Amino acid sequence: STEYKLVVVGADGVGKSALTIQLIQNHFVDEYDPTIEDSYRKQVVIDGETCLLDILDTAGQEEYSAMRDQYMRTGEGFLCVFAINNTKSFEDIHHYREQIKRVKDSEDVPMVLVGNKCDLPSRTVDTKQAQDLARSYGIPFIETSAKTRQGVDDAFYTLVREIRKHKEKMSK
Ligand SMILES: Nc1nc2c(ncn2[C@@H]2O[C@H](COP(=O)(O)OP(=O)(O)NP(=O)(O)O)[C@@H](O)[C@H]2O)c(=O)[nH]1
Ligand SMILES: [Mg+2]
Ligand SMILES: [Mg+2]
C-alpha cells in the first residue's frame, strides 16, 4: 500500500527532528544535535489506509543549495516548520515555499504549516499571522509541541491527506 515521501523543512532549531522522533520513536529529544540529513520509515493507518511514510528530516541550514534542491525534487509533501518563539523561522517559510514551487515548476505543492514549541511562553509569532499565511497559501496550519507531543500525529497525518487530495486533483 501507498508510500508517501514527506520532507520536514525549516530553520535551525525549530524542532524538525524532535517532531519526527516523537512520531517514529515516541519520545522527546531534549538535546540539540543538529541534523545533516536523516530519514525514517513508518507504517501507519490514516483514514483506514495503510501508508508507508518515508520521512526526510532536513538540516536547519544547508551547506549546498543543490542539497535543498534535491529533497525538494523528491518530496511529495512538505512539513514547513517554524518555532512560535523564532520570528525569523516564520519568515523563512516564504523562502522555503518559493524554492519548492520553483524546483517543482508548480503553484500547487502539498504542504502543511506547523508552528512548533506551543508549550513555550516566549511567543513572538501570533496564531493569527500563521493562520493568515496558511489561508493565503491555501494549506493547513497545525500548532505542535514536540515536548508534550500535542499535534504531532495530526501534523503528519494532515500532510498525507494533503498529498492524497493533490493526487486526486492532478488526475482531474
Ligand atoms: N520546549 C520545546 N522545545 C523543543 C520543541 N521541539 C524541539 N525543542 C528543542 O529545541 C532544540 C532543537 O530541536 P531540534 O529537534 O534539534 O531542532 P531542529 O529543527 O531539528 N535543528 P536542526 O535544523 O539543526 O536539525 C532542542 O533543545 C529541542 O529539545 C518543543 O516543541 N518544545
Ligand atoms: Mg534536526
Ligand atoms: Mg532548513
Residue numbers in the entry: 1 to 172
Show the paper's wording.
The RAS family of oncogenic proteins is important as therapy targets because of the frequency of activating mutations in almost all major cancers. All family members function by signal transduction to the nucleus of cells via interaction with effectors (such as RAF, RALGDS, and PI3K) that catalyze phosphorylation of downstream proteins. When KRAS is bound to GDP, the protein is in the inactive state and becomes activated by nucleotide exchange from GDP to GTP. Mutant RAS proteins remain in the active state and hydrolyze GTP at a much slower rate than wild-type (WT) RAS.
As a comparison with the KRAS169Q61H crystals, we also determined crystal structures of WT KRAS188, mutant KRAS188G12V, and KRAS188G12D (all isoform 4B) with a GTP analog (GppNHp), using crystallization conditions similar to those described previously for full-length KRAS188G12D. When the crystal packings of KRAS169Q61H and KRAS188G12D mutant proteins are compared, the switch regions are more solvent-accessible and less sterically hindered for the Q61H crystal. A further comparison was carried out between the switch regions of the two full-length KRAS structures (G12V and G12D) with our new KRAS169Q61H structure (amino acids 1–169).
